[PDB]
């Protein structure tokens, strides 16, 4: 009687985190999570993109277009990243969905962050993207692309 | 917004669920998630051996002659893990109803609420104590019911 | 004649702002606890290990890459990133933009004391505004007893 | 004077006379590497279920009326007791050496090493289980050689001629 | 036999007393907060990093110049509204750390020293800053600890 | 012209000093660890709760309150050279370095004793010579 040899691994488990913390993001166009890991491949910060705490995905506008900014859900939204580690976090790496924006950026070498796993750089090109790559360079953060083992993963309730 | 969102009790034990994926346990795979009262996760475990013990030479079987040679005097289960990863005050989603050993270490932890999706095991004398160290110690329980069987998570949906 | 204790934070603030190396604007901010312990204080510059001279702080460009606003921190998010501070509250020169409310909020900061609010009917501002409302984080102008402080190192002696 | 070693087990030994415990009396000592006492424990049930209602003896006709489902041993009790922020790295001088399911919590406490007094049931299966968890985990264990065997405290020491 | 929870903080106190090397005073300290947590212990020595050099000197500029007393350790170890037993009643320099450390209560065994100045200006110093002081009376003047037991 | 941090440190130091309701003299101290942090402020005055008394022995000093106000390793940043009772809080604080302003009472006992102290200990004590001589916080700037 042995050990399994099918287990899910450390890597996909703290993406598979970040992805399964997207899900509960209320914005109809974008579902973004994060997850923050020490050097102990311990979890130390979860967070998912929406609106800030106490204010209600009902009451603050998720349109992307409008004729006044103030009638958009870009004053008032809440990235992933910026969520985790508001949720220390020194010599810690981020999982991420997607490549940072440079504001994520800001505060990911504010905390002390050290490294950025991400799944997606759809944006490589944007000016976000770019600067961003340019504060982490400076700062000597690492950004690295997931290569996952398998595509999805299955959470079954009824397997207990 | 959206009207399919994952919710918060959902989204708690389905941590716990994904956590016990980890486990390298051949027969049983338990998760435990702890949530403080900000609706935040501060500890999460799975069942397995201690940190720097090996998978390979502490035995994984259910019985044997020796007890030495079953997995029980060495493995951890989930809820030990997930409040050695304070956690005073805050509630633990666990897959299965905490023996009376978990209920100990989850009492003087300070945790104030038990959510488990299986009670398997009602009848045990693990779990009838288990349940009476939570009354007199003013920990409440109850099952989760899911709003759906199955979450499915695809890293390719960024894409 | 002894300075309060607000008076006392808010000059951390302002003394704080001197440590910037931003040519053309110094900000600063000071976090305090309901024990009016200084919890963190921050002023605003490049990122961590970053404008060593490299990054632009120019306020106008070609593009904006070429501008210090893709890469500038805010007194606000250095305080906060300089030491939890739930419960506690912030003291800043000028009232936070919106980007800061949610930093602040986020924080768990229940209260922000300003001296100026000269950008009132901006956008950004009245984000702010909306958002602490909704959140329940209280703001509200500082009044000085005294418009200046000297700090005199020679007064010991 | 007290030496440190001394001391902490001292201190342990004293903490087990808070047990209600009629039979067994256990106590646990954390100290960190800057020799201050970081948690302290005895055996006991658990917090809110200590107001003699749950059984102490040993035998009976049903297991659940021991007190062997109930108890908490001294060294979870310690560890439970302060980990400001944590213990780990710390090390827990004890007065009986750990059974297996305190080598559990000891290990993912990030203890790293056991100072114990009696080894007593060294030849049980929980004690063999415990030394190699101990020793996998690389969680160092020594038997503690006390330079005497008897400390005495007095509370009339403060006034009392020397 | 079983120690009720006073009885042991004493015993605490009394016992770090003993890692004391002054011949001429051994005292401890055992701060103690509101869920019966330890948060520090002290006894009286010479201060960090310390016969001691220059002692004449400084005796000229007490006979003790340079000692650290139960009290202050105890508070640099640790206090929040805490309790702290004290084998010795609290000189006034102690009062002060221990109204500044935010100590509600000290619980004294000994108060050898009442009419000193030092024992008058701190029941003072408590009186003015509402802290409570009593006497600890216990049952036996002795416990044993016997390494043998177990 | 930017402020550096040993000059922004005793800035708070002498900032921190104002709020002592003793009229005889007001000091401060600011302690701070290695990653300049602050991580404890004190000005000097009465017992916490003591402060509306008067007592024609009481006085609390800079030292001891940023101390009590939250330090092994760290900087402590005061006006005034400590006295022996401070130093002593001091070192068993674990503080490595009291950088100081004043040591106008160098030739006292009480100063003698803390250097002694000090000396004995290992703690590092730095006279502060600081390269602006005044510093203007204006709240009409803004
Ligand atoms: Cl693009
Ligand atoms: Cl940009
Ligand atoms: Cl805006
Ligand atoms: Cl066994
Ligand atoms: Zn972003
Ligand atoms: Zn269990
Ligand atoms: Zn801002
Ligand atoms: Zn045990
Ligand atoms: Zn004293
Ligand atoms: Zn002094």
């Excluded at 508001?86 to 991420?96: A, E, F, L, T």
Aim: aromatic fraction near 10%; hydrophobic fraction near 40%.
């Amino acid at each position: 009687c042995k050990k399994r040899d099918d287990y899910l691994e450390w890597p996909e488990y703290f993406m598979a985190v970040a992805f399964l913390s997207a899900q509960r993001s209320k914005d109809p166009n974008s579902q973004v999570g994060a997850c923050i890991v020490n050097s102990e491949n311990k979890i130390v910060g979860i967070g998912y993109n929406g609106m800030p705490n106490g204010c209600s995905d009902d009451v603050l506008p998720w349109r992307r277009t409008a004729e006044n900014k103030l009638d958009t859900k870009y004053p008032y939204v809440c990235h992933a990243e910026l969520n985790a580690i508001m949720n220390d976090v020194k010599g810690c790496s981020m999982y991420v969905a997607l490549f940072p924006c440079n504001e994520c950026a800001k505060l990911i070498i504010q905390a002390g962050i050290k490294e950025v796993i991400f799944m997606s750089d759809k944006y490589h090109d944007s000016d976000e993207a770019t600067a961003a790559r340019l504060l982490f360079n400076m700062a000597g953060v690492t950004f690295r692309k997931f290569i996952p083992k398998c595509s999805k993963i299955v959470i079954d309730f009824d397997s207990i």
